[PDB]
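User: Quick sanity check before I run a bigger batch. Here is a single chain. Can you write out its predicted 3D structure?
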Amino acid sequence: FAAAVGLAAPQXPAF
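Assistant: Done. Predicted structure follows.
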């Protein structure tokens, strides 16, 4: 499951 978060992570600041 690491990939799930790692691929998402750079988009988080769109918040």
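The radius of gyration is 8 Å.

User: Great, the batch can go ahead then.
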